[PDB]
Amino acid sequence: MKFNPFVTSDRSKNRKRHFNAPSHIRRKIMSSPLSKELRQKYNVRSMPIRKDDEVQVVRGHYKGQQIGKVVQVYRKKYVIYIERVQREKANGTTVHVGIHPSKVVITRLKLDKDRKKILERKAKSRQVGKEKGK
């Protein structure tokens, strides 16, 4: 269990840090698991959600195998918007339904120089841990 005397297990404190988190760590909070193929291709498990990667919803009303591209990462509300995850409202227009990034798996990563740097960053640390506990 937790032994570090400088990290708190207080429920009020953890909730306060979570809901008042700055956007640059709200990104880390809003991470998603990768698919089994991606988790095998890269030696990484989770990844912060990105604007233009495409995921499938695994929990809720919109569960299925359909692949939808992320269209908005709305960090203030801790939700992401996906293409076809939407509903009709009263006056006939469509509104995106925000779902938590922990309830999707990333099937494909929007890859730029920065993601690739983070991807090999995480994999290298995992490999060090594997050879430490060998």
Partner 1 sequence: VSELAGHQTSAESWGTGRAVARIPRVRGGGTHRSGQGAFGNMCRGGRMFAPTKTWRRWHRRVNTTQKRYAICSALAASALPALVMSKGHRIEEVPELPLVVEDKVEGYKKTKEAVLLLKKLKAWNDIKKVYASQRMRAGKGKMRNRRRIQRRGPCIIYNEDNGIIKAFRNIPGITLLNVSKLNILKLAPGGHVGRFCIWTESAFRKLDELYGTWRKAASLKSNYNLPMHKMINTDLSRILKSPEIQRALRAPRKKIHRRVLKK
Q: Report the distance separating Cα 3 and Cα 72, nearest Å.
A: 38
Bin 92: left if φ > 0, else alpha if -120 < ψ < 50, else beta: left
Among 56, 67, 69, 98, binds RNA (CB under 7 A): 98
| Least Å from the CB of residue 133 to partner 1 | 10
Q: Which is nearer to partner 1, 2 or 76 (CB)?
A: 2
Q: How many CA atoms lie within 13 A of 106 on its CB side?
A: 28
Site residues for RNA, 45-84, by CB under 7 A, read: 45-46, 48-51, 58-63, 72-78
Min dist CB 108 to RNA, Å, is 14
Question: What is the Cα–Cα distance from 126 to 134, expressed in whole angstroms?
Answer: 12
| Shortest Å distance, C-beta 41 to RNA | 14
DSSP 37: H
Of 10 and 114, which has the nearer Cβ to partner 1? 10
Residues lying near partner 1 in the complex (CB under 8 A):
1, 9-11
